[PDB]
Design a protein around this ligand. Sequence first.
Ligand SMILES: *[C@@H]1O[C@H](CO)[C@@H](O[C@@H]2O[C@H](CO)[C@@H](O)[C@H](O)[C@H]2NC(C)=O)[C@H](O)[C@H]1NC(C)=O
Ligand SMILES: *[C@@H]1O[C@H](CO)[C@@H](O)[C@H](O)[C@H]1NC(C)=O
Ligand SMILES: *[C@@H]1O[C@H](CO)[C@@H](O)[C@H](O)[C@H]1NC(C)=O
Ligand SMILES: *[C@@H]1O[C@H](CO)[C@@H](O)[C@H](O)[C@H]1NC(C)=O
Ligand SMILES: *[C@@H]1O[C@H](CO)[C@@H](O)[C@H](O)[C@H]1NC(C)=O
Ligand SMILES: *[C@@H]1O[C@H](CO)[C@@H](O)[C@H](O)[C@H]1NC(C)=O
Lengths: 250, 191, 243, 49
Amino acid sequence: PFPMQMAYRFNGIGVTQNVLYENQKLIANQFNSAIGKIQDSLSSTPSALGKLQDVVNQNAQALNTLVKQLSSNFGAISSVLNDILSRLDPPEAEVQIDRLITGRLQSLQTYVTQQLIRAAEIRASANLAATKMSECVLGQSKRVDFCGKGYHLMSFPQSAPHGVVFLHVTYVPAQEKNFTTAPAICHDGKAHFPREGVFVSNGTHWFVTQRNFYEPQIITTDNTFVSGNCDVVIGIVNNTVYDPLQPELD
Amino acid sequence: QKFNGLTVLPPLLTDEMIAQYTSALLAGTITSGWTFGAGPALQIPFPMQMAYRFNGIGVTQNVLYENQKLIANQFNSAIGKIQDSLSSTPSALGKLQDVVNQNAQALNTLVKQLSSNFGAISSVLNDILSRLDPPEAEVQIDRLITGRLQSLQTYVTQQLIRAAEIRASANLAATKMSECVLGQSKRVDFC
Amino acid sequence: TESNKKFLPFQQFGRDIADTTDAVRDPQTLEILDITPCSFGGVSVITPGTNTSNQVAVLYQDVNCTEVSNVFQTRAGCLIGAEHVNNSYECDIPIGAGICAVASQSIIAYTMSLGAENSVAYSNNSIAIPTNFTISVTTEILPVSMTKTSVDCTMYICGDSTECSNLLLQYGSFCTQLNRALTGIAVEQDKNTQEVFAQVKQIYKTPPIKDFGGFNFSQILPDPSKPSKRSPIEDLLFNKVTL
Amino acid sequence: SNLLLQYGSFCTQLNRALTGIAVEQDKNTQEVFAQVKQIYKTPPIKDFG
Ligand SMILES: *[C@@H]1O[C@H](CO)[C@@H](O[C@@H]2O[C@H](CO)[C@@H](O)[C@H](O)[C@H]2NC(C)=O)[C@H](O)[C@H]1NC(C)=O
Ligand SMILES: *[C@@H]1O[C@H](CO)[C@@H](O)[C@H](O)[C@H]1NC(C)=O
Ligand SMILES: *[C@@H]1O[C@H](CO)[C@@H](O)[C@H](O)[C@H]1NC(C)=O
Ligand SMILES: *[C@@H]1O[C@H](CO)[C@@H](O)[C@H](O)[C@H]1NC(C)=O
Ligand SMILES: *[C@@H]1O[C@H](CO)[C@@H](O)[C@H](O)[C@H]1NC(C)=O
Ligand SMILES: *[C@@H]1O[C@H](CO)[C@@H](O)[C@H](O)[C@H]1NC(C)=O
């Protein structure tokens, strides 16, 4: 089921599943509105397709100059070889042709070399597109800024003339807050560290929360673990840790 | 340097602006870890950040807190040693010096080609123009144009290949910029 | 111009690296004059665009501002027509050496800003944590292939004339290396498109009911009612690039 | 120069390739370094634990 797919994709970037299911409607609205905005972005901002237009323009220009090099004397009495062959004696037509063979073969060599280099550039861009197709749509990438700015969730491939367009759906932290923190909790001599997330305080009470989304939880023995004692960790606050066993036995 | 027809345009980003960008990235890495790449700069104490970075490599965060002073001393010692390492081992900056050397050598060997007759009578076009009548100077000047144009074509071709190589290195550098500085990489020996 | 190079009594003129004349000793005195080629350089035109305005500024890339209405000297050359303004902005038209360039109905030149200044409230007991979250979608465009052109070396160079064909045959195999290289590029373009797209051995198909929990993929999934079964976005891409 | 004008457009192909390289170098520097939307600044007190 696709909502569970997206919930696991949230899990893969360090946001627990319950963020999605409680907020599924808002997530849907944001995804749909962003996809809707993509149309206006592509259709209203010029140069957006510049990376695809540049290659076709460069090839059209290379062909145009290659053909225009036929309209060049290169030291010959005329550009059209038919006129030299029809007007000059072979003993001199040979020399007049040589000075067009040389210039047109040199133009062909220039074009071929430029095409080999631009083909190598397109080879590298195609290999990058294949790597992104494997690692962004076919899977999920943990490498930042490889599948767009933000925490990667998924990508959608789209065809384009002589190219590919990726729609990268990414998770971005939004409104934020400023909370006091501590690297450990000292309780009756033991040092408590979080299993996942960090300790936060608003002044009065200490909680544990996942680092990529504020979701305060009471500090318990099932989300913290003990190692060492309070005199080794630099910068500890004093709070109490609640064990669900206490209310079950009392 | 400035010769006949050769210019060097200045880079758009001066070294001051490049340094200001690296200062911005360092302030981001120091004060907010990897979060300034994904979105907004989120304040985190540096030891908690380094505890996250230990968590990401399979070493429990408490190992940082119990060994914070040793970690700080080792990090400061290594950072201090990097200066002596690169400043005392020659060829350490060879990858950057070689680019400058190849570009300067290509320009010098483009200029040197102007002092070659290319099969004519004198490598100076003004001398052949001043000693041969135009109807005969035409062929020798054709030689001094074809050879010099072929030399310029060879130079431009080698610059296109070298630009492609440097672009590959720049793309790898941007990949490392994102996947090593802006975050933390699980890719072995990539960072 | 005057020089401070002490020529030896027997040399008359001096040379610089890579065989060029650097200085010469005045025959009628003991003076030694350095010879510097007089300022020259390419000319660049800064234009906002005929679509917006026909106002233009012109930059001389390697001369001072003493060689032919505001005139401003930059490390990139002498720019005439643009007024230099002290306040920085986002880089728009690149000039060089840190200056970019239209605003207030005139062309302006300024030192580029690198972004807003934003210090982080660092402290060893304060963490910021997001209290909400935005999902964003970005567009990344990559070329995969280019037009598989091919040029017939012999008929291009030596149009339908046997007389030139004999000389071209005296030029050996060039008309075979060029066809071989272009054929290699043509096949490599198909290999590129295959490696980019042919990553699934079997063709999956979407279900007829779009009950995706509130997610709406109608903008990226193929529309069967169209003659070419392409998505609206793919339609915009095919209708947005022009030949 | 009038004699050179008989070799077609080589002298604009070279000066378009060199300009392509020139702009590609600024693209390289921008793509490597300009990955921050803001210029961040370090605090004056270097108490980084
Ligand atoms: C989290 O952010 C989202 C959007 O950023 C808020 O959802 C609504 O989104 C639309 C635009 O997408 C806005 O016009 C509304 O102002 C947003 N709020 C409401 C109530 O509709 C969402 O409310 C935010 N959640 C919290 C807890 O602040
Ligand atoms: C915290 O409690 C311990 C004993 O459990 C005490 O010694 C210490 O002074 C208290 N305050 C701190 C660590 O700030
Ligand atoms: C701080 O957290 C506590 C615990 O939930 C809450 O009761 C209080 O209202 C919060 N805000 C304060 C103390 O300003
Ligand atoms: C609150 O936020 C400001 C800036 O956003 C920060 O300087 C401060 O340390 C945070 N915490 C408190 C308790 O003010
Ligand atoms: C940093 O920690 C030390 C001791 O751990 C403390 O004295 C200092 O006040 C802390 N910094 C700030 C800004 O409070
Ligand atoms: C999905 O988006 C399309 C966009 O045209 C809209 O017409 C449609 O009503 C939306 N909802 C569904 C369920 O398709």
